[model samples]
Target: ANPYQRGPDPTESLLRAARGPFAVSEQSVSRLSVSGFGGGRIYYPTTTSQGTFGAIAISPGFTASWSSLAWLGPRLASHGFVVIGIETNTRLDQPDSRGRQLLAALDYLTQRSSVRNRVDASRLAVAGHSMGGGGTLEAAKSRTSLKAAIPIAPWNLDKTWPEVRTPTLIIGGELDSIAPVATHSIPFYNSLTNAREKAYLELNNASHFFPQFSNDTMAKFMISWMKRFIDDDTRYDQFLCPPPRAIGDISDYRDTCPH
Candidate 1:
């Protein structure tokens, strides 16, 4: 397999800008290669600190393209983290193979001078939607390099949670029928070991596509989260390590669910 390098170019395009005043320009996009997954686009936002860059590896749900997390990628870039959104060939609820692809992306990113230093290779995070969510957790369970993880509406695969040592955040939707909290989020959150930081969120009015539909707020939350742990940007600490209530209506399933 061959690797292709993409841009440090700047661009301004997104579904919508931030809700607050003084909206910053979003990140840019480019392509790269991974062994089995073929080649795909990597959306990177302009960093606040040009000399250093932090990285994020986004694995899309089964059959979903890189664009699925477009809303979150640029927002992370804007907040000083370099977001790499990886596309998987499998369709919805098929993230098993893409889980391996994430490792390839990690290998590819660590070799680049631009990515190597800026990215706290030892402090990387993995996050995904639906199938990709389960894929990230599966990868984190065995990958020691991962520092944090976020699995949103993942497929029911709580069996692996016992092995996930990295900090994790699981998001769910009250109306989500595709991957409900009862089967996926709650169960997985219960299996995590005591060493890892964990939490679960259930958005009141959302469905399966809450991140896509609730782009602005979700983007802000992601940007803040990545910066605190990945880039050490504390300006948005409210999001980085928020108060229990700050995350809103999601319950702590840590108590009731069986591992």
Candidate 2:
């Protein structure tokens, strides 16, 4: 049995919901108090009986603040993970810098946050939107201990991720002009030759800013990936294993399945 697993048996409907089983509470982190990253918000499960939950750090895209992706913090937290949505040291910070900030946020979440006691530092994850999504790859590359990563509509000069050992899920919008799939997502996914497992889910007719708003297809996969890898919970395997069909809002889907 997986010691990290939480919640009841998996169901497609649960992962697609706006909230999970756990009640969520949020805490503010001020910029003046952190060293490596600017402060943002930390969302966590309010219950204390689940043991220590896995944690994840999320960064926003270029010229964006924590509020742009704010919805994800509480959404993911209610699903039984600690989520930190960070502000960049400056709004223009690039992906590489955002990457470092994501890791820094995770460090703060587990080491010094008020709720650090509720986090299991060993099982952590990272995610971001746009350039911050690019940073997600950087965070994983810098720290291989991460169990999972979700990079949504990512933009980066370097599209190759042969160095990432962590299992990763990359989401791209079909209509994303900012980071075109031909050059960014597709190339990045194809290049992740060394990752434990990898998948690419492209949203049909969606734009680069799709991640800013809540979408069930995106939320479901994000939760499934976190559960599948970070929690080592195989219950999510059903959603991911078959390489979810590219139907409805999903324009295309690919994975390293049957592995």
Candidate 3:
């Protein structure tokens, strides 16, 4: 029997509310800061567990700071991953530069002894919003170690990304003018033919800044995708493989995975 057909409805109300299974805490990455990037905040789960958590590094869009993507820190951390919301030295930094900075942050996460033991360097991912979203794809293309990536309303001057192998979830806003789905997210999603797994979600009536706001739809898919790819957790497979029922604010969704 297919496991997805018999589960207790994993997708039902999973992200309808805020918060997750663990208590969350925040602190400065300056204690273990990487060079060439602004000191930023690290959000992690407070609950003790024998298992090491997967680590994720996030970069904000052009002219945006860590605060722009701050909500994701606690949301993802509480779900058993160590999340770092990093800040670039300058807002004008391009996607490729931001991509390198994200990897640098990941390096810091693995080398810092204070919290190093809490994370599994082998299981890692990258995410970003807007230009930072484009950066996530850039990093995934260059870094094979990245298990997953989520790029929200990503904007890049270059639309070609044929080398991305990491599983990716590209979220776009249907109403966005800045990084229109027609040109950016949709085309980018279509370009990742070699990705391990991929999905494209376009929110209804949403704009470029929808990722910054609290949306259960984004949280649900983001958490599940990370859990499925980064942790290698099978529990999230049901929600992902069969593809969850699209309701609420989702205007368009395209999902594909190996059978």
Candidate 4:
């Protein structure tokens, strides 16, 4: 029933791989080329046979650039998304600003970026780390059109997100001093009273910068969330529904499952 589904029917091994089935390519977006956000790189699948892909816009944490989470671009794109890893207007931009730029970057992706033709403007999502992760919530709030929101160890002052209507998955670090799950991620996840669905996954021994590098655990859940929501692909649910246990790096998991 879903025309949005792409890729082979998912398997645990494929989703956990460093890359997916699709070969990838990237393009650079200069600062002068857009507004509302600084420019960055766009990673996309090389195949046109599957039709336009869903897109995701990601923001780096405070005092960071897209390079902080740069591995995600091609990793996600190869899973069949037009992923834009953006550079904030400034390294110190707050979560609210980071959120705005995420939306802006998505706009550039769908309407003007060089590979715009390969993107399904309607099937978009947002993600970020630290402050940018907080921004992910903000972006989801501002754009109800968003298909999903994955905020990684996200930091934000305003904890209550009762207004957000997007399906959301909040990832946090068990030992994060920067944005403690007790005060940030937990409260944030709990506050999603109106979300289409929500989930929380706490990495066993991670810290705030856990998202700064390549990690299979983080990438797989992200891929699953985007696939389930953005692509409306249920094949990925096998990994999410019962919620993986204290195996590997995943220490605790919770969700609005039976989804």
Full-model lDDT for every candidate? 0.59, 0.92, 0.83, 0.92
Candidate 2 has a TM-score of: 0.98
TM-scores of the models, in the order given: 0.75, 0.98, 0.92, 0.98
Least accurate 10 contiguous residues by lDDT in model 2: 250-259
Indicate whether candidate 1 or candidate 4 has the larger lDDT.
Answer: 4
lDDT over C-alpha atoms for residue 111 of model 3 = 85
* Model 4 TM-score, all chains together: 0.98
Off by over 4 Å in 2: none
Look at candidate 3 and give me any clashing residue pairs: none
Positional deviation of residue 223's Cα in model 3 after best superposition, in angstroms: 0.2
For model 4, residues 76-183, the per-residue Cα lDDT tens digits are: 999999899999999999999999999999988888778989999999999999999999999999998899999999999989998899999999999999999999
Model 3 worst lDDT run, 10 consecutive residues = 1-10
Is candidate 3 or 4 superior in TM-score?
4
> For model 2, how does the per-residue alpha-carbon lDDT over 21-84 read when each residue is reduced to its tens digit?
9999899999999988889999999998878899999999998998999989889999999999
